[PDB]
Amino acid sequence: LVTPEDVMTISSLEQRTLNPDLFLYKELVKAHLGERAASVIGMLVALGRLSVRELVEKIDGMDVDSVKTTLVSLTQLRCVKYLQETAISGKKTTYYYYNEEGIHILLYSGLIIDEIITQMRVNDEEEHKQLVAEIVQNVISLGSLTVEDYLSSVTSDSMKYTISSLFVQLCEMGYLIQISKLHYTPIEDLWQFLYEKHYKNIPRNSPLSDLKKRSQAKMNAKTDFAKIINKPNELSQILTVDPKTSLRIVKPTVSLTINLDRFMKGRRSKQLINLAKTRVGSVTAQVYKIALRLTEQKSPKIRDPLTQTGLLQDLEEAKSFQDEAELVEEKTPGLTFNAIDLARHLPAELDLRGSLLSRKPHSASLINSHLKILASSNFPFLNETKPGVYYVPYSKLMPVLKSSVYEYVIASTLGPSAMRLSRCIRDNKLVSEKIINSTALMKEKDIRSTLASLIRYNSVEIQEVPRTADRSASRAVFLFRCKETHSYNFMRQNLEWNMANLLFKKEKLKQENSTLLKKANRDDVKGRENELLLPSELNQLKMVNERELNVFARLSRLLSLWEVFQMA
Amino acid sequence: EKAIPKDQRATTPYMTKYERARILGTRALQISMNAPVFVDLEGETDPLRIAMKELAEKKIPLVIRRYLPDGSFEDWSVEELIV
Amino acid sequence: NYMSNLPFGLGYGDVGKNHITEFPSIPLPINGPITNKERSLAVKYINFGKTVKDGPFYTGSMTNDGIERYSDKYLKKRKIGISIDDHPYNLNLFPNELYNVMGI
Amino acid sequence: FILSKIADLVRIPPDQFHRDTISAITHQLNNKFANKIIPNVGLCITIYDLLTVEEGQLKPGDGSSYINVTFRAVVFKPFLGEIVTGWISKCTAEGIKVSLLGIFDDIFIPQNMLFEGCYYTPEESAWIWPKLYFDVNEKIRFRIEREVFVDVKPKSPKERELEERAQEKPPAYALLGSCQTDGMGLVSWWE
Amino acid sequence: MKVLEERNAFLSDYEVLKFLTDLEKKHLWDQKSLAALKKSRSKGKQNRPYNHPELQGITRNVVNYLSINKNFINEKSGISKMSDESFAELMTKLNSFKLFKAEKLQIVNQLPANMVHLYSIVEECDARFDEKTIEEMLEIISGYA
Amino acid sequence: TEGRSRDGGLRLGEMERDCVIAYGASQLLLERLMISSDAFEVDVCDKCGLMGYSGWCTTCKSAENIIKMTIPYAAKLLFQELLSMNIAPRLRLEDIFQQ
Amino acid sequence: KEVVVSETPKRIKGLEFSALSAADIVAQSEVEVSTRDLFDLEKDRAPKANGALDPKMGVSSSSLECATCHGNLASCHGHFGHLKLALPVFHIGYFKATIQILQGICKNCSAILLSETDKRQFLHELRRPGVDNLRRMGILKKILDQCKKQRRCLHCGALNGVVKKAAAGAGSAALKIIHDTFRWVGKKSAPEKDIWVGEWKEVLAHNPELERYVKRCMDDLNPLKTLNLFKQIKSADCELLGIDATVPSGRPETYIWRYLPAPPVCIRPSVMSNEDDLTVKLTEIVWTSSLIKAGLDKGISINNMMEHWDYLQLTVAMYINSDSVNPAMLPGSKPIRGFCQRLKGKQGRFRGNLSGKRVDFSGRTVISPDPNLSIDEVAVPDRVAKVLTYPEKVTRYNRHKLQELIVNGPNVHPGANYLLKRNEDARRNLRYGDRMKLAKNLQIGDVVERHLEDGDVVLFNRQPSLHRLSILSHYAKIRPWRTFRLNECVCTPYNADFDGDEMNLHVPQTEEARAEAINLMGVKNNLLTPKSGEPIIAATQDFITGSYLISHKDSFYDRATLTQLLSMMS
Amino acid sequence: YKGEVLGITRFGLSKMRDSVLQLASFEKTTDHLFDAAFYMKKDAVEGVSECIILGQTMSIGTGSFKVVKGTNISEKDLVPKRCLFESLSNEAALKAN
DNA sequence: CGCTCTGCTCCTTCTCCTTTCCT
DNA sequence: AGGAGAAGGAGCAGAGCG
Ligand SMILES: [Mg+2]
Ligand SMILES: [Zn+2]
Ligand SMILES: [Zn+2]
Ligand SMILES: [Zn+2]
């Protein structure tokens, strides 16, 4: 037997109580910044919006100075937001928030650098790879940067063009935007500010009714919100300027940051390619690989247009968001494309020659065949506006991507019988056990065992039906549902918790084994630790580094797993 | 927390019944645990009665700390308080 | 007697002993061997998380004796420090309250 | 030796009320800090002076005077630039332990930092040089490089019971030195 | 119970003998009580204040250690019988030879009267000064005994 | 005990403690209601408000933040019963002295 | 070696209430209660290794050992175990709190049904520098009404109806919560209603009998579904619900039964054997939990399994409080003594053992009058004065009298009963041991427990105790008979009438208690009632008629009669 | 005294007592203790009922003042001392640097 | 202009709490 | 019992609507 004392050390029952959001954010900021940043971030996440005096009163550290330093560091890493508001009765009190998108840069850093390296297509030139890697690394590690700072951070009398021509190339592909106050401002607070000043300048006792006034304010603030949101995302005027006898060079004064939205869209493109590779041929998916990369730059925003976070959803009129999503995703002129466009950007390696059998040189008639294959597939990979016109229906492809990833996680963890039963109950509606036996053809004992193993997660819901006034469990007949929202909700929290657990374990290992990293720093760890003898020390270093690499690999796989559930 | 100075004290100068009973009990404890006394004993063994005699002769070496509701205090001795 | 009840699929031998493993048993397919791509990704992840910690924005900390001899003299200083004041800050991005701690 | 500054709480029993206040304060202080190590400051020897004494306060059941007091004690704690003599008593094949004169013998000076040409001779020979050796109960000199402390005692009651049934950390104040430069080892090497 | 100040002025090995000797003089002096003195005080036959065993033992060990010959030589120490005026008037040469440290306490008790001892008293002692202010310190700090 | 036959102590009830409070007698309440009825020594942790045993915390396995004090055995029993439901009456301690 | 140690006196400052997070319950344990068998019977009723009476949690008699800190029934404080459950279950103490948490959050994404400005205003109102329980309760209730008024999640736009609890009876279907999603949508078409009708169309085609039961079938919240929802509630909105999320276990999910702590055997001792209700109930808990766990993997009937899960609910519910008014649901079967029953009533913990106790050094006998007894004095029988000792410490002023008492010994009234040396621990009984040499070796710090003598301060009491003059402090006076005697003047404060009246005597055992008793409750200091300020201790019937007959105008006395009267008076 | 007519019942007694221990001592014990557990009621032990329950000293009557014993200690015999000491340390480098 | 929400105001059903104890 | 407290219903003027 294992005693309860041994349980608290080996098993992670101590960490099974911590909240997944607080655990993961706190671990990330503790890994990358430290204990004060973790304290402030934990307090913000646990309590919400706070002021500096409230932070001092809450955290044991009563040194305002320490709080101010922690807040400036957290703002430079844009892990926090601020809202400086003024009370009508007197003075003004600022307030602070925790930035979900700021921490996710630390959570995604290696993947971000990977994407920026691979998309510049600098695999030809070695120095280009090092240059873009250094640019993106320094930007992420510094929070925000300027071209002047980067150019003065290099030896003079050199070819500044070589280190600046790709910078504009970075800015032109959407992997770099300028930073403004909207990034540090809460979206719902901005929507509250914009909804007023349109419900206030209304004439007194106007002929328009109160409902009409509120609707008028809504659709007159939506336009301003859209303008302010779209301004920093896509306005290339900074890179459009051009000093005389020079190339296209960005404005020195503007300060640049990473554009998380573009990276998220790239991740969605990757997920779509990987899911497409499982329903058609590699040749067909090879074209899909370049079709998605062409529309990626102009693709719609992924997590939200920022308008669901901005307000109450509606009385019943999220249809006014669904319809606009369809309208954009189709009527975008860049998004619409034909079989002619795909010819030019087609890979040189691809042949397309014998991939097709009709009746059972990069020709445009070959592409149309595979695009018709994509449209014919059960998954709406592509849809046609007019014969010869093509577009990707995100509004209908994201639910199927989510459901497929979910059911395959179920298959890989629980039984294939569990996957079959989950799909059976989902396809059906409110199916009873006798009918489950009828349309699933599996023994009732096994069906019950798998159903129980499935209810431990939010995957199968029970719908009771009572036959007596007192809802006895003997006289009631029990049904089943699936409730896709609950199931996706549980799945993302589980993966978030497990990422938090892995990062915590890595930090614990480094804590225990820093006694060798001290000597490593003493003796120039890279390549020389063999010369310091201590073969036990070298072996311990080896296995701890192996554990670190494995931790990072499993973390990246967990990231790919929870990405689709993080979508909406 | 601080102490109200000797020159300005706003509390009564008359010892109370509670202060008297507490002083007698504390001194009786001190004597019963073999403390030196300061009055001629005559024939007596009880620490309580020795303490009563000492109080009547005004020879008890203790002072009283009076706590106001805010949290400051004043120091009154037994040779100052009267009854 | 509270021991009379018994389900059909259960015998007296199976019941009567509460045993919940409390240790996990259903793994995830993400813990297989490593790949070269994931290896290089881990390397860059290691370079990150390290560069920032050795950088200026740390805020991490939450025999320096008084006796003076020649050992303290000409002693190699361990590090050249950095402060919040050094890094160039764009003043618009920061609220007015925090200007005091940064070097104006 | 150094001087410290420590605040404390001292309880004076009614038996000692006849004595002087300082003469009883010093007595309870000497009881508390007679020959003991105060953690992370060294080993206290003797109370030297007395600087602050509050007014004695009484709790509702004891009848004694509880007094806050600050004082400056005499503590033994050399750091690096020190030199201490003595003679060696007990040696083992893990390093050499030199003793003081009845104060403490919890100082451990390693053999590896002892000069250069020295090694342990299990042939009952005191030491080996490539050309003179010392032995038990002879004058020596040395230094201390780093001073370490240990204050561990997480003995659960079951651990206590099992240890008692089956039946180490003697030193809570451990020092480590070296014997590199000439002059140490023994002063009677010369003249 | 809190320790306020880690270290006050360095209680050099000059007063650490006077204070302990005065303590022994005040109570439990064994230089003449070994003659079977039977002075009765307080009527208990104890005849001594502060029968305290622990303090007496440690103070005897310190006074014995500082009475044994200071081990720069192989029969007093040279500090146990140190005149008070000597400690205040031999300061002149120590201060004039600017060692640029606080090792004044190191020499007043340990390793006079030798060259190697004076050399190992401080680091690079030859390099800092080797012309006239080695023999001068030896002949001053060794002139007491 | 309370038996007519055993050495049954006499009960000092609610009305009687009310009378004694009305007289303003604190030490007599202490004597009659703790010392001479059920006075028990307990060990309580200082970082968590939980009673230990034998100088051992048994929740944070340290034995470094344990404080001894006397409380009624009925209070000890009530605290252990409260912990037996899902109630955790953490005890906070303060120094008696230090002004 | 020999490190310094310190001991600073400490005072209780304040209680702080919470719940255990199921990690504290496991940190709190020494063993896990796994089996159902109390005794292994291989060693003549020796307790099982992992049962309800496992010795690791203490012993019930003084002939055993507790296996954690080896000590008998005396020296063992007691140790806890834990009891993991196969299926999550509700906590009846926190049932209405669980209802209140559900009514304030979304049942799809678990976001609080408030607006950012609204919740900011409520938060500002909660953290005002002067706020007590009444204001806090008012603000929280207002928050509850506001979120009950909200109709659609601001984050996910779902639908939320009333979240009442299924009310069917005290015992049966009591702990069932129903969500009525489609109560606030009337004469309207919503996607939720369309999905509901689409789902229900299929079932009726296959099963045409549930047409009667198309109504009802609300969104039921079983304990596991409710637990999975609570794990997603954000931390930032815990304050609006009534929970401090700063500390671990500050979480709505820690109010659901997932680990039961196993109480120490001190709390549930085995009498001379017979067990008790708490132990029996927890054996039944282990039984039903094991049944659930074994049946879950065997694929037993879902209809059968939910009937057992409901039974485990009522089992842990009746172990915390006996409130199942209809126990007919239990096939085996409300006089059982649960945890709640051990704290309530006139004879519970608070009103029986904490605020009011039973004390040592006390007596009770009939009372009789005594005119020659001074007021301020009470007359104690010698027989009870020889058992009600007072512990006198040897203090250089009473050594001779104390050794004379030791020599006299318990047989004679001016004697002592026990001796307690300074260094020693146990009291030396003086009934044996040649007390002559003990009296010689008596030192100046020992404690002698001597018989009650003349002048000892005692308390005297009559029941019922209406006003504060029902208990007064007297002076003792040893006398040859068996009753308690008092002067008839001081009968008025007690309301005594020597017709069989009995009174209680208490002997304070400390110097401070003695001095306060005599100086504040003494008869001479309580001649006046404090309700009016009028005399209460004065003459009585004969003491008044005799005075009147003396001072009548017809009474003339010569010198012999005068002087005899004066001598009688003194 | 709190702006409204609060009676002497159990419902009124939740006026300003704010003490879970004494409210449980009075009436509706388990409801009060469970509410204190849920809302994390954090009472202080100052009332006479809590003082009795925990076996502490009341704050009224004889427990409303502090007894203090004058130490009767002079002040001029508390000065720091070290004889013929400070001639060396500080002055060793009080010139040329 | 009936219609249709949102909100009171009224009402019914459902538990708690009742004296000294006297060994 | 009586005696208040509290949680859920049930009809109803109110206010906005095309
Ligand atoms: Mg009568
Ligand atoms: Zn603890
Ligand atoms: Zn035990
Ligand atoms: Zn929602």
Asked if residue G257 and residue G404 are part of one domain, the reply reads no
Number of H helices, E strands in chain E: 8, 1
The rounded distance, in Å, linking the Cα atoms of H32 and H25 is 10
Q: Identify whether residues G293 and G402 lie together within a single domain.
A: no
Rounded to an integer, what distance in angstroms lies between the CA atom of residue A485 and that of residue H48?
A: 54
Please check whether residues G78 and G23 belong to one and the same domain: yes
A94 touches A83 (CB < 8 A):
yes
- 8 Å CB contact between C51 and A141: yes
Specify the length of chain H in residues.
97
User: For residue A10, how far is the Cα from the chain centroid?
Assistant: 32
Q: Strand runs (DSSP E) across G161-310, as ranges? A: 177-179, 219-221, 256-262
Question: Which range marks the domain in which residue G362 is found?
Answer: 347-388+451-534
Contacts of F26 in chain D (CB under 8 A): 60
| CB of A115 closer than 8 Å to CB of A269 | no
**Residue D50: in which H helix or E strand, if any?**
strand D42-53
**What gap in Å lies between CA A491 and CA A328, rounded to an integer?**
30
Quick one: resolution in A?
3.1
- Quote the Cα angle for D163-D165-D166, to 5°: 65
Among G361, G362, G344, which residue's Cα sits nearest to residue G353? G344
Range of H39's domain? 7-65
Chain H 11-70 residues whose Cβ is under 7 Å from strand J: 11-12
| Contacts B28 to G, Cβ<8 Å | 511-512, 514-515
Residues of A in Cβ contact (< 8 Å) with C94: 72, 75
Residue A403 and residue A399: Cα distance in Å, rounded? Answer: 6
Domain limit, last residue, from D23, D48, D76:
D76
Nearest CA in chain D to F26: D60
Tokens coding G3: 């490190």
G223 and G145 both lie in a single domain: yes
Are G121 and G57 part of one and the same domain? Answer: no
- Exposed/middle/buried for C54, CB within 10 Å: 0-12, 13-18, 19+? exposed
- Residues 6 or more apart from G202 whose CB is under 8 A from it? A428, A429, A430, A431
Amino acid residing at D20: D
The number of the ligand nearest the C-alpha atom of G156 reads 4
Report whether G158 contacts A486 (CB < 8 A): no
Q: What are phi and psi of G192, to 5 degrees?
A: -60, -45
Q: Ligand 2 centroid to F57 CA: how many Å?
A: 5
Across the interface, whether the CB atoms of G302 and A478 are under 8 A apart is answered: yes
Claim to verify: residue D94 and residue D185 sit in the same structural domain:
yes
Q: Give φ, ψ of G235 to 5 degrees.
A: -75, -35
Q: Which segments of A451-502 are extended strands (E)?
A: 461-465, 477-481
Residues G88 and G224 sit within 8 Å (Cβ to Cβ): yes
**Domain of residue G426, CATH code:** 3.30.1490.180
**Structural domains in chain B, sorted by start:** 1-83 (3.90.940.10)
Q: How many domains does chain D have?
A: 2
Tell me the residues surrounding ligand 2 (ion) with CB < 5 Å: F 45, 48, 57, 59-60
Q: Which of residues 191-250 of G touch strand I (CB under 7 A)?
A: none
Task: Tell me how far apart the alpha carbons of residues G305 and C7 are, in angstroms, rounded to a whole number.
Answer: 8
Same-domain status, G142 and G47: no
Torsion angle (degrees, nearest 10) of CA B27, B31, B32, B33: 110
Q: How many other β-carbons are positioned within 10 Å of the β-carbon of residue E136?
A: 12
Residues E113, E135: Cα–Cα separation, whole Å: 9
Q: Are residues D111 and D146 in the same domain?
A: yes
What distance in Å separates the CA atoms of residue A462 and residue G87, rounded to the nearest whole number? 15
Q: Is C70 exposed, middle or buried (0-12, 13-18, 19+ CB in 10 A)?
A: middle
Q: Whole-number Å distance, CA G348 to C1' I17?
A: 15
Tell me how close the Cα of B29 comes to any Cα of chain G, in angstroms.
5
Under a CB-based contact definition with an 8 Å cutoff, are residues G521 and G385 in contact?
no
With touching defined as 3+ CB pairs under 8 A, do chains E and D touch? yes
A52-A57-A62-A64 Cα dihedral, nearest 10 degrees:
10
Query: In this structure, are strands G80-90 and G29-32 parallel, antiparallel, or unpaired?
Result: parallel
Tokens of G227: 């637990």
CA nearest E128 in C: which residue? C70
CATH number reported for the structural domain that contains residue D124 in this entry = 2.40.50.140
Between β-strands F39-45 and F10-12, what pairing exists: parallel, antiparallel or unpaired? unpaired
What's the rounded Cα separation, in Å, for the pair C27 and C47? 29
Cβ-based contacts (< 7 Å) between F 13-32 and strand I: 13-15
DSSP characters over H3-65: SS---SSTTTTTTT---HHHHHHHS-HHHHHHHHHHHT----S-SHHHHHHTT---SSGGGSE
Neighbours of C26 (CB within 10 A): 8
The DSSP-derived string for A138-185 is HHHHHSSB-HHHHHHTS-SSS-TTTTTHHHHHHHHTTS-EE--TTTTS
**Spatial distance from the CA of A209 to the C1' of J14 (Å):** 18
| Contact by Cβ (8 Å): F15, G467 | no
A–G interface: beta-carbon pairs under 8 A: 170
Q: Which helix (H) or strand (E) holds G369?
A: strand G362-369
Cβ neighbors of A78 (< 8 A, separation 6 or more) are A99, A102, A143, A144, A179, A183, A184, A257
Which B residues in the span 8-67 are in contact with F, Cβ-Cβ below 8 Å?
17-18, 21-22, 25
10 Å CB burial of residue B10 (0-12, 13-18, 19+) is exposed
Q: Is the CB of G300 under 7 A from strand J?
A: no
Same domain for G85 and G105, yes or no, is no
| Domain hosting residue D144, numbered range | 82-189
- Spatial distance between the Cα atoms of E60 and G153, rounded to a whole number of angstroms: 83
Interval between CA G462 and ligand 1 midpoint (Å): 11
**G residues 156-215 lying closer than 8 A (beta carbon) to F:** none
Q: What are the backbone dihedrals phi and psi of residue G431, each rounded to the nearest 5 degrees, phi first?
A: -70, -10
Provide CB contacts within 8 A for A441, sequence distance 6+.
Answer: none
Bond from prior residue into G464 cis (ω within 30 degrees of 0): yes
Distance of CA A242 to the CA centre of its chain: 35
Q: How far is H78 from chain B (nearest CA, A)?
A: 22
- Number of inter-chain CB pairs under 8 A, B vs H: 38
Distance A267 CA to J18 C1' (A): 48
| G197 and G97 assigned to the same domain | yes
Closest-CA residue in chain G for D156?
G69
Q: Is G95 exposed, middle or buried (0-12, 13-18, 19+ CB in 10 A)?
A: middle
D66 and D91 in a single domain? The answer is no
Does the C-beta of F6 come within 7 A of strand I? no
Residue G548 CB neighbours (<10 A): 8
Same domain, G168 and G180: yes
Q: Dihedrals φ, ψ of B71, to 5°?
A: 135, 0
Residues D7, E40: Cα–Cα separation, whole Å: 37
What is the rounded CA–CA span in Å between residue D29 and residue D46?
9
Chain H, 71 to 90: residues with Cβ < 8 Å from chain B are 72
Q: What is the CATH number of the domain that holds G524?
A: 2.40.40.20
